Design an enzyme around this catalytic site. Structure first.
Site, short mmCIF file in Angstrom:
data_model
loop_
_atom_site.label_atom_id
_atom_site.label_comp_id
_atom_site.label_asym_id
_atom_site.label_seq_id
_atom_site.Cartn_x
_atom_site.Cartn_y
_atom_site.Cartn_z
N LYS A 1 0.87 -1.17 0.00
CA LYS A 1 0.00 0.00 0.00
C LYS A 1 0.91 1.22 0.00
O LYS A 1 1.66 1.44 0.95
CB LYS A 1 -0.88 0.01 1.25
CG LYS A 1 -1.78 1.23 1.38
CD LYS A 1 -2.20 1.48 2.83
CE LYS A 1 -3.59 0.96 3.14
NZ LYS A 1 -3.72 -0.50 2.98
N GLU B 1 0.12 -8.08 4.45
CA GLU B 1 -0.20 -9.46 4.17
C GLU B 1 -1.10 -9.36 2.95
O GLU B 1 -1.99 -8.51 2.91
CB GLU B 1 -1.01 -10.05 5.33
CG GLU B 1 -1.14 -11.54 5.29
CD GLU B 1 -2.21 -12.10 6.21
OE1 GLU B 1 -2.24 -11.76 7.43
OE2 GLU B 1 -3.03 -12.89 5.69
N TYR B 2 -0.86 -10.21 1.96
CA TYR B 2 -1.68 -10.23 0.75
C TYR B 2 -2.87 -11.19 0.98
O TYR B 2 -2.67 -12.32 1.42
CB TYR B 2 -0.80 -10.68 -0.41
CG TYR B 2 -1.56 -11.12 -1.64
CD1 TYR B 2 -2.38 -10.22 -2.34
CD2 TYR B 2 -1.47 -12.43 -2.11
CE1 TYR B 2 -3.09 -10.63 -3.46
CE2 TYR B 2 -2.18 -12.84 -3.22
CZ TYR B 2 -2.98 -11.93 -3.89
OH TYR B 2 -3.68 -12.33 -5.00
N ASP C 1 -14.01 0.56 12.95
CA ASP C 1 -14.10 0.85 11.52
C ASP C 1 -14.37 -0.42 10.77
O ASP C 1 -13.99 -0.59 9.61
CB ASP C 1 -12.82 1.52 11.00
CG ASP C 1 -12.98 2.13 9.59
OD1 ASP C 1 -14.12 2.45 9.17
OD2 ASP C 1 -11.96 2.29 8.90
N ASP D 1 -6.96 -2.21 8.29
CA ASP D 1 -7.26 -0.81 8.56
C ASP D 1 -7.48 -0.42 10.00
O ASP D 1 -8.55 0.09 10.36
CB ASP D 1 -8.48 -0.38 7.74
CG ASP D 1 -8.20 -0.30 6.25
OD1 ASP D 1 -7.61 0.71 5.83
OD2 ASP D 1 -8.56 -1.25 5.51
N1 LIG Z 1 -8.62 -6.39 -6.78
C1 LIG Z 1 -8.59 -7.66 -6.07
O1 LIG Z 1 -9.10 -8.64 -6.59
C2 LIG Z 1 -8.00 -7.74 -4.83
C3 LIG Z 1 -8.27 -6.75 -3.85
C4 LIG Z 1 -7.66 -6.83 -2.57
C5 LIG Z 1 -6.76 -7.91 -2.25
N2 LIG Z 1 -6.19 -8.01 -1.08
C6 LIG Z 1 -5.52 -7.11 -0.44
N3 LIG Z 1 -4.60 -7.57 0.44
C7 LIG Z 1 -3.89 -6.63 1.14
C8 LIG Z 1 -4.06 -5.26 0.99
C9 LIG Z 1 -5.03 -4.87 0.06
N4 LIG Z 1 -5.20 -3.57 -0.10
C10 LIG Z 1 -6.26 -2.96 -0.59
C11 LIG Z 1 -6.80 -3.30 -1.88
C12 LIG Z 1 -7.95 -2.64 -2.40
C13 LIG Z 1 -8.58 -1.62 -1.64
C14 LIG Z 1 -8.07 -1.26 -0.36
C15 LIG Z 1 -6.92 -1.91 0.18
C16 LIG Z 1 -6.46 -1.53 1.42
N5 LIG Z 1 -5.91 -0.18 1.61
O2 LIG Z 1 -6.50 -2.29 2.37
N6 LIG Z 1 -5.77 -5.78 -0.66
C17 LIG Z 1 -6.49 -8.90 -3.23
C18 LIG Z 1 -7.10 -8.82 -4.51
#
Ligand SMILES: NC(=O)c1ccc(Nc2nccc(Nc3ccccc3C(N)=O)n2)cc1
Length: 265
Positions: A39, A88-89, A133, A151
């Protein structure tokens, strides 16, 4: 934090989401070949928005807290024009995305998510940390489709008094937080109640057309049910959506409730 990285220690992949604070990318740690999310936030935004603390709180809390239903923070770092967060993903996106894709959830997903969510909160509360939240947009899904909270920027220690200028929407907040009053570990329980209702109905119980309109609905706990919502569900939702924070169930009471137990995998 024993190690320190640099944007160069990664191979950025496809964009995952988000917008104005910055975006989130799929990342690959070169050394290890480790997959994760990166991020990226712009200092320009941070400063001008004065979120220096929520970011500190997020990186703060989420760094320590370690639970299978809480999204991990591995560290961070900032280059000349911005800050990066090593996360973490979560392979299956957000729950917010699943809900659009399915409209509403059956009593099984609903029950399950609520469970995983309660354990994660039950744990968060262990450490007097209230999320404040919990909305479907802050709920990711793991490689096995398990809920994973993220978050914790808006997250703080309780009891608390903070009145923080706005949240965009009042949908998930309880009367106390809107009413500007003091709040505690129970804010997360009213939210659990909202998520539950939304998960089964397809819309949060206090949805309105105007911020003001919703504040009314919330402050008076005015919510009804579609006909498909079963009594077991209604019971638990009506128990969580109590004006009096002290009258809301403890997480164990929620984790044992008949309807939850009758449908959570
Ligand atoms: N487009 C998809 O298929 C997809 C969306 C999300 C994930 N997972 C994920 N893991 C970790 C962090 C993260 N961040 C964010 C992604 C989108 C919106 C907000 C955040 C966030 N600020 O947490 N998203 C995996 C695939």
């Amino acid at each position: 934090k024993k190690r320190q990285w640099a944007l160069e220690d990664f191979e950025i992949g496809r964009p995952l989401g988000k917008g104005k604070f910055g975006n989130v990318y799929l990342a690959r740690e070169k050394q290890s070949k480790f997959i994760l999310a990166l991020k990226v936030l712009f200092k320009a935004q941070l400063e001008k928005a004065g979120v220096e603390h929520q970011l500190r709180r997020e990186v703060e809390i989420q760094s320590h807290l370690r639970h299978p239903n809480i999204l991990r923070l591995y560290g961070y770092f900032h280059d000349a024009t911005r800050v990066y967060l090593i996360l973490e993903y979560a392979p299956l996106g957000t729950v917010y995305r699943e809900l659009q894709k399915l409209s509403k959830f059956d009593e099984q997903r609903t029950a399950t998510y609520i469970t995983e969510l309660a354990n994660a909160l039950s744990y968060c509360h262990s450490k007097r940390v209230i999320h404040r939240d919990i909305k479907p947009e802050n709920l990711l899904l793991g490689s096995a489709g398990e809920l994973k909270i993220a978050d914790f920027g808006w997250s703080v220690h309780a009891p608390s008094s903070r009145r923080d200028t706005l949240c965009g929407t009042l949908d998930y907040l309880p009367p106390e937080m809107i009413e500007g009053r003091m709040h505690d570990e129970k804010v997360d329980l009213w939210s659990l109640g909202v998520l539950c209702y939304e998960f089964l109905v397809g819309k949060p119980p206090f949805e309105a057309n105007t911020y003001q309109e919703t504040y009314k609905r919330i402050s008076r706990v005015e919510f009804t049910f579609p006909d498909f919502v079963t009594e077991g569900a209604r019971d638990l939702i009506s128990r969580l959506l109590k004006h009096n924070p002290s009258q809301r169930p403890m997480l164990r009471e929620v984790l044992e409730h008949p309807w939850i137990t009758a449908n959570s995998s």
